[PDB]
Amino acid sequence: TDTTPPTITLPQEVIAYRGEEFEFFVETTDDSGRVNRVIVRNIEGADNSTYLDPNWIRYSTDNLSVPGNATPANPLRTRVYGIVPINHGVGPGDRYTKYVRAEDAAGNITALVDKQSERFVLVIRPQTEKYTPQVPTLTYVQNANSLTQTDKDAVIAAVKSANPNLPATSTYSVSENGTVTITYPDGSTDTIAAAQTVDTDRVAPVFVDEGRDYIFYRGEEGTAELHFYDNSGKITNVNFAGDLAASSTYNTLLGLGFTFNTPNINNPNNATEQNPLVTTIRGTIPKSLPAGPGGKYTFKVRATDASGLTSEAKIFRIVFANQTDKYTPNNPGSLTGVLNPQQLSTSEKTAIEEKVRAANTGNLPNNVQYVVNNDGSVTVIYPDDTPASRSRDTITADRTVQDLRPRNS
Ligand SMILES: CC(=O)N[C@@H]1[C@@H](O[C@@H]2O[C@H](CO)[C@H](O)[C@H](O[C@]3(C(=O)O)C[C@H](O)[C@@H](NC(C)=O)[C@H]([C@H](O)[C@H](O)CO)O3)[C@H]2O)[C@@H](O)[C@@H](CO)O[C@@H]1O
Ligand SMILES: CC(=O)N[C@@H]1[C@@H](O[C@@H]2O[C@H](CO)[C@H](O)[C@H](O[C@]3(C(=O)O)C[C@H](O)[C@@H](NC(C)=O)[C@H]([C@H](O)[C@H](O)CO)O3)[C@H]2O)[C@@H](O)[C@@H](CO)O[C@@H]1O
Ligand SMILES: [Ca+2]
Ligand SMILES: [Ca+2]
Ligand SMILES: [Ca+2]
Ligand SMILES: [Ca+2]
């Protein structure tokens, strides 16, 4: 008959964190295939004892005392689980050696032998041994020895952002110099040193487009996109009117009807090199301003970061261009026969103008003017043309006129 007790397989050590749920499994088999009892108990007590302390160590075994419940293929599974109290000690003696016994249906029970038979040690550790926080992105501040509440909130946010797997019940404290204390729910802590959380902001924002000339064609609306970034990733102000000369130029452009829009100025993380802050300048230089050496506005812009560092005044320009600088007429698809190449008739001029018109729809402005000259060359006058800033193209008479005079006999 069966004289062999069941075989019990279980972890020798189970680390359980203070405050948290723990669970592990004990596996029991027997050659009979049936196990009738699995017991977790204190060493103390008579052979029949099932007294077990602490009260929060719990166990359960589904399928007890069922034929076929304890085979090698399908071992009997006993769950050992509980919640460690939040105020349990985590000292070296905060451990429990408890004994697991099993009995088959023939009554064979595993022997209970102090420090030798089947047992586990449940070891209670602080939550900080489970969690290792990651360093945040550096927060750049005006004074790393005296953080503002805004600085501290930013460090906490950057620590929480880099630590999505820490307990949600974890609290964060930032000291005057940026040292971060993370307090887990059991009162254990981690520290992130100030060197890994904050540094002094010593670099003013950068105007990426310093020195750039933005071309605006007279009489056509244009835009200029200006880009800024800071080492902190944040700009708080862009200032085109930092002194009298700058202000004058700025207000002159406003006077022409331009707009300046920097929509992300109040957003966080609005100004990195990869994703810079963008100021868009939109407007039209009217034709009443001529192009030429003086046909320009030289601006000065400054940008300030959240620590109060303001860049030097940095130059960019708007430079005016005539429309002829961006348009090139297409020649007519055929020449027009002329009886007298030195003096076209009205009908010949009309025919040329029509061919030049047809060749240029979709290319030149719809409000260009064509003047067919007496020799059949065509003056193209763009709508920004003025006496002070002529804006024109010429199509030569070899591209428009074909002499029809016969050849001698
Ligand atoms: C009460 C007594 O003297 N009993 C002895 C008995 O001693 C127990 O033997 C166990 C091993 O079989 C352990 O060595 C027990 O020590 C520990 C443990 O379980 O590891 C030490 C831990 O530090 C302690 N944990 C805490 C938080 O204090 C636990 C705990 O007090 C108990 O597990 C109760 O939950 O105990 C040791 O106490 C053994 O020596 C037998 C031999 O026959 O004689 C008496 O029964
Ligand atoms: C208008 C004025 O006299 N402002 C002076 C200021 O002198 C200005 O300083 C600017 C640099 O910050 C430019 O050098 C200004 O010159 C230009 C320019 O912007 O490039 C010359 C251009 O030809 C002119 N454009 C047109 C279409 O006439 C512009 C334009 O007049 C201005 O930008 C409008 O404000 O100006 C230069 O004039 C400087 O001298 C300060 C010192 O306190 O005093 C006034 O603000
Ligand atoms: Ca057996
Ligand atoms: Ca830790
Ligand atoms: Ca900065
Ligand atoms: Ca042209």
Residue 269 lies in a domain: yes
Amino acid at 220: E
Distance from the Cα of residue 91 to its chain's centroid:
43
- Beta strands per DSSP E along 105-192: 119-125, 139-141, 171-174, 180-183, 189-192
Q: Rounded to an integer, what distance in angstroms lies between the CA atom of residue 273 and that of residue 364? A: 38
DSSP 188-235: -EEEE-GGGTEEE-----EETTTT-EEEEETTS-EEEEEEEE-TTS-E
Expressed in angstroms, the distance from the first to the final Cα of the chain is: 139
| Domain shared by 40 and 96, yes or no | yes
Q: Is 67 in the pocket of ligand 1 (CB under 6 A)?
A: no
CATH code of residue 45: 2.60.40.4140
Q: What is the CA radius of gyration of the chain?
A: 43
Q: Rounded to an integer, what distance in angstroms lies between the CA atom of residue 398 and that of residue 352? A: 12
| Domain shared by 219 and 320, yes or no | yes
Element (H, E) at 149: helix 149-162
The angle formed by the CA atoms of residues 250, 252 and 254, to the nearest 5 degrees, is 70
* Cross-strand pairs, 27: 9, 77
Smallest CA separation from ligand 1 atom 31, residue:
96
Domain membership of residue 176 as a residue range: 139-200
CA of 197 to the centre of ligand 4 (A): 17
Residue 310 three-state SS: strand
Residue 31 three-state SS: coil
Q: How was this structure determined?
A: X-ray
| Domain shared by 121 and 161, yes or no | no
Cis-peptide, bond into residue 387, ω within 30° of zero: no
Structural tokens at position 369: 């003017």
Amino acid at 1: T
Among 41, 114, 118, 125, which residue has the most ligand 1 atoms within 8 Å of its CB, making it the best to mutate?
114
Residue 401 lies in a domain: no
| Domain shared by 222 and 247, yes or no | yes
Amino acid at 246: A
Structural tokens at position 246: 């700058």
| Domain shared by 18 and 62, yes or no | yes
| Domain shared by 223 and 239, yes or no | yes
Q: What ranges in 212-345 are assigned the alpha helix state H?
A: 244-255
Query: Which numbered ligand comes closest to the C-alpha of 382?
Result: 6
Structurally, the chain folds into a number of domains equal to 3
Domain boundary among 267, 297, 325: 325
The angle formed by the CA atoms of residues 84, 88 and 91, to the nearest 5 degrees, is 120
Domain boundary among 129, 155, 186: 129
| Domain shared by 102 and 165, yes or no | no
DSSP 53-120: -STT-EEEETTTT-TTSS-SSS-EEEEEEEE--TT---STT-EEEEEEEEEETT--B----TTTSSEE
Q: Rounded to an integer, what distance in angstroms lies between the CA atom of residue 250 and that of residue 261? A: 13
Q: Rounded to an integer, what distance in angstroms lies between the CA atom of residue 13 and that of residue 10? A: 9
- Residue written as token pair 């008959």: 1
List residues near ligand 2 (CB under 6 A).
244-246, 248-249, 252, 289, 294-298, 300
Adjacency order of strands within the sheet including 76-83: 7-9, 21-29, 76-83, 58-61
CA of 317 to the centre of ligand 2 (A): 11
The angle formed by the CA atoms of residues 9, 12 and 15, to the nearest 5 degrees, is 125
Q: Rounded to an integer, what distance in angstroms lies between the CA atom of residue 146 and that of residue 141? A: 9
CA 324, 330, 336, 340 torsion-angle sign: positive
